[PDB]
Specification:
- With 390 residues, the chain is an alpha/beta fold.
- It folds into two domains: 1-129 and 259-344, no CATH class; 130-258 and 345-390, no CATH class.
- It is built from twelve helices and 15 strands.
- The strands form three sheets. A seven-stranded mixed beta sheet has the order 7-6-8-9-10-14-15, sandwiched between helices.
- A hairpin with a 6-residue loop joins strand 12 (331-335) and strand 13.
- Helix 4 runs parallel beside helix 5 (159-175).
- It is globular, with a radius of gyration of 20 Å.
- 50% of the residues are buried.
- The structure holds potassium ion (K).
- Potassium ion binds next to loops.
- Potassium ion (K) is lined by residues 142, 145-148.
- Disulfide bonds join 119-385.
- Belongs to the leucine-binding protein family.
- Component of an amino-acid transport system.
- It comes from Brucella ovis (strain ATCC 25840 / 63/290 / NCTC 10512).
């Protein structure tokens, strides 16, 4: 029997590897569970790791190496720029090597193009995307009565920030808010956000939507606190590890929408968090739940694949993913065939002292206040995705 070989292509060493190493932990955790159940095709699944130190260009080289080493599946998630390279190199390879197609399981790259203008049959996204993040965070705040009528959009000036801005603008009419002004700023360089905060203060808004991460999120929220800006921040990345530890009371009351919260589904979500901590050493945070749950859906798909003469057929695997659904610790996970965007619940959360599980050793944690089903969470199919089918 031919074993299934899955290549993890991630930043796996050095000072920039924090997020890649969380993907590694989630991948080894859930592929470990699938191997505990017997693997695939009567053999354990082999996990091949490729440390990419070279960004998009390095990823092209590592994808070539993985395929040459016999991987039939590539997994990655820490960078949309790298994901855009992987998904196109995989698509191009597949077109030129009919019958030998490789799958790309995208476990966390959230740029809209991956299920839109770059969508294709051998890519599957198991994580949120910009539209899911910001439609659900806005709707959750609207439903709770804390959104207000006036909003500001502030994001980083690259593909991700543009996707977030476009989403926030597009949903204003339907959800019921006004985007008073919008700003795109330099990426991961600004130390003093006070001039941007002054503009937001002048706009007299209730809510600030931002897809910012790391310093661009934290230093912006801190400048807002120092200036007495009263608006709530509506974010996608407030729960990066360390953010609450570094912001403390400055983060209290601000909002994030994510696929998981350990308090959001009673014993099921707690038991998962404790099991994950037993295996990996930490509670599953940030990017890890979506990667685990996506690989849970993947494992369910494998269970439903019929083996033919012991050779692995990635087209059969892709069709099985389209058809699969699994109950995760957060509820039902399935896959949309039109664009291969996964359908799954989203939990809108507030930083609060009243959360039972604390973040970063502080008095604060993420308190869940609204859960949307997958049907309520998934974004509309983009007019730009036209997927050629086998
Ligand atoms: K409201």
């Amino acid at each position: 029997a031919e074993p299934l070989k899955i290549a993890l292509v991630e930043t796996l060493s050095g000072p920039q590897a924090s997020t890649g190493l969380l993907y590694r932990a989630a991948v080894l955790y859930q592929l470990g569970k699938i191997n505990e159940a017997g693997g695939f095709n009567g053999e354990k699944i082999q996990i091949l790791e490729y440390d990419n130190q070279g960004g998009p260009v390095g990823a092209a080289d590592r994808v070539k190496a993985a395929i040459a080493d016999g991987a039939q599946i590539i997994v990655q998630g820490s960078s949309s720029a790298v994901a855009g390279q992987i998904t196109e190199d995989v698509r191009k390879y597949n077109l030129r090597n009919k019958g030998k197609e490789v799958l790309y399981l995208n476990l966390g790259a959230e740029a809209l193009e991956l299920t839109g203008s770059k969508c294709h049959f051998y890519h599957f996204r198991f994580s949120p995307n910009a539209a899911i993040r910001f439609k659900t965070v806005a709707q959750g705040m609207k439903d709770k009565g804390i959104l207000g009528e006036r909003a500001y959009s502030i994001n980083q000036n690259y593909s991700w920030g543009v996707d977030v801005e476009n989403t926030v603008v597009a949903n204003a009419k339907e959800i019921g808010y006004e985007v008073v002004d919008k700003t795109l700023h330099e990426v991961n360089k600004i130390q003093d956000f006070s001039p941007y905060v002054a503009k937001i203060q002048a706009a007299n808004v209730d809510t600030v939507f931002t897809g910012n991460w790391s310093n661009d999120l934290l230093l912006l929220m801190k400048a807002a606190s120092g200036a007495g800006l009263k608006a709530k921040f509506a974010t996608s990345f407030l729960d990066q590890p360390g953010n609450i530890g570094n912001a403390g009371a400055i983060a209290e009351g601000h909002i994030v929408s994510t696929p998981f919260n350990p308090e959001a589904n009673g014993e099921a979500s707690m038991a998962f968090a404790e099991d994950y901590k037993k295996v990996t050493g930490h509670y599953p945070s940030y990017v890890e739940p979506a990667a685990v749950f996506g690989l849970q859906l993947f494992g369910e798909a494998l269970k439903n694949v019929k083996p033919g003469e012991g050779k692995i057929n990635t087209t059969d695997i892709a069709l099985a993913i389209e058809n699969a659904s699994v109950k995760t610790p957060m509820g039902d996970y399935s896959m949309r065939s039109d664009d291969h965007q996964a359908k799954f619940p989203m939990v809108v959360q507030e930083v609060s002292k009243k959360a039972r599980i604390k973040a970063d050793g502080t008095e604060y944690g993420f308190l869940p206040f609204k859960t949307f089903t997958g049907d309520e969470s998934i974004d509309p199919v983009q007019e730009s995705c036209s997927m050629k089918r086998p």
